[PDB]
């Protein structure tokens, strides 16, 4: 959840918001180790429930999200239903565990390609065009993340937009991401320069991946 003024500005200027619970357990092995564990349900529940209690009156918020990259655990299904019960006015989405689990109203993959399948075991990233028509599938698809804009990037961006415009159930996505997470450091003469991972003696680090 963002600084409260963010929603006020989105209400007034006009932007659709996905408001997202502060839950990410990316580094766990497997990713759902905590989210499938009932002992972590209390802690997870408060990150979801308290977000809804704070932000449910903002018109800019159109979609709730259970968090990010925490696999798919029974705790997600429980909190999905909690939101659906408390606030019927907004769809709930969540990408973890393969982007099309029972904890999501929207097929919301990250970095699924337009035409190319990436058939990873357990959590495949189908071509988005293919994903829509999988046997029994009926939901809209909106990429929670796509077109990773790291450095000299956004190659193939037009391929997404051609597809979004051709397929009714391909309803767009959220580019990753808005702003480089570089930090200011200063040389011996006080001149500022942009620093990334590792530049503060931080180790292990993931270098320029913050930008």
Ligand X SMILES: CC(C)S[C@@H]1O[C@H](CO)[C@H](O)[C@H](O)[C@H]1O
Selected range binding Na ion among 32-40, 42-50, 65-73, 202-210, rule: CB under 5 A: 202-210
Among its own copies, ligand X, Na ion, none, partner that 36 touches (CB below 5 to 8 angstroms by kind): none
Q: Which residues pair with 118 in a beta bridge?
A: 125
Q: How many CB atoms lie within 10 A of CB 52?
A: 19
Strand-pair category, 192-195 with 183-186? antiparallel
209 binds ligand X (CB under 6 A): yes
Instruction: By CB under 6 A, tell whether 20 contacts ligand X.
Output: no
Near its own copies in 96-125, by CB under 8 A: 117
CB of 113 to its own copies, least distance (A): 12
Asked if 172 contacts 143 with a C-beta cutoff of 8 angstroms, the reply is: yes
Q: Is 145 among the residues that bind ligand X (CB under 6 A)?
A: yes
Asked if 20 is an active-site residue, the reply is no
Told to judge if 69 belongs to the known catalytic residues of this protein, a careful annotator would answer yes
Tell me whether residue 52 or residue 123 sits nearer to ligand X (CB atom).
123
* Residue showing tokens 């919301």: 108
Q: Which of 51, 110, 141, 147 binds ligand X (CB under 6 A)?
A: 110
Q: Measured in whole angstroms, how far is the alpha carbon of residue 121 from the centre of its chain?
A: 21
Q: Which residue, 23 or 141, is less far from its own copies as judged by CB?
A: 141
In 104-193, which residue ranges form alpha helices assigned H by DSSP? 128-132, 157-166
Of 44-52, 54-62, 157-165, 193-201, which segment contacts Na ion by CB under 5 A?
A: 157-165
Nearer to its own copies, 153 or 171 (CB): 171
Contact between residue 34 and residue 87 where contact means Cβ atoms under 8 Å apart: no
Give CA–CA dist 68/75, Å, rounded: 13
Cβ–Cβ < 8 Å for 139, 100: yes
Site residues for its own copies per CB under 8 A:
117, 127, 129-130, 132-136, 138, 166-169
């Amino acid at each position: 959840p963002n600084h409260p003024l963010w929603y006020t500005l989105c209400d007034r200027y006009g932007l659709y918001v996905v408001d997202e619970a502060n839950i990410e357990t990316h580094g766990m092995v497997p990713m759902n180790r905590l989210t499938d564990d009932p002992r972590w349900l209390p802690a997870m529940s408060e990150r979801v429930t308290r977000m809804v209690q704070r932000d449910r009156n903002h018109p800019s918020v159109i979609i709730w999200s259970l968090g990010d990259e925490s696999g798919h655990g029974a705790n997600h299904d429980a909190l999905y239903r909690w939101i659906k019960s408390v606030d019927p006015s907004r769809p709930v989405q969540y990408e973890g565990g393969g982007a099309d689990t029972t904890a999501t109203d929207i097929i919301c993959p990250m970095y699924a390609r337009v035409d190319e399948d990436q058939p990873f075991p357990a959590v495949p990233k189908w071509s988005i065009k293919k994903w829509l028509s999988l046997p029994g599938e009926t939901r809209p698809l909106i990429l929670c993340e796509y077109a990773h804009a790291m450095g000299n990037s956004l190659g193939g961006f037009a391929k997404y937009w051609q597809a979004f415009r051709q397929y009714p159930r391909l309803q767009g996505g959220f580019v990753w991401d808005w702003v480089d997470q570089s930090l200011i450091k200063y040389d011996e003469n006080g001149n500022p320069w942009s620093a990334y991972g590792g530049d503060f003696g931080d180790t292990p680090n993931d270098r320029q991946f913050c930008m």
